[PDB]
C-alpha cells in the first residue's frame, strides 16, 4: 500500500541518479552542489514524483538504505562517484 507507493518513488528518484540519466540531465546537474549534493525537497518537486506523493517522509523512508543514493540531512546525491557530475548552475 503505502510500501508499494514507496517502492514506486525509490524507483523513480534511483533513475534520476543513474548514470543513464545523468549523462543527459543537465538540469539536475545545474542543480548539485560541488559534493553532488540535491535537497531533497528539490527531488520532490519533480513532476513525477509529486504525483506519487506529498509526503516528505515517505520520500525520505523511500530512499533509506538505497544502494544508489546516500541522504545527509536534507540533501540526497549519487552514493558512487558523486563528485564528477555537478556542472555550473
Ligand atoms: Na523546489
Redesign the pocket.
Known amino acids: 500500500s503505502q510500501e508499494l507507493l514507496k517502492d514506486y518513488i525509490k524507483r523513480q528518484i534511483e533513475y534520476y541518479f543513474s548514470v543513464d540519466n545523468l549523462e543527459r540531465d543537465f538540469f539536475l546537474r545545474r542543480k548539485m552542489d560541488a559534493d553532488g549534493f540535491l ?1 531533497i ?2 527531488i ?2 519533480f513532476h513525477r514524483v509529486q504525483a506519487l506523493t506529498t509526503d516528505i517522509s515517505l520520500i525520505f523512508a523511500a530512499l533509506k538504505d538505497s544502494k544508489v543514493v546516500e541522504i545527509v540531512d536534507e540533501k540526497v546525491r549519487r552514493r558512487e562517484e558523486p563528485e564528477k557530475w555537478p556542472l555550473p548552475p
Request: proline content about 20%.
Open positions: 535537497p525537497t528539490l520532490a518537486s
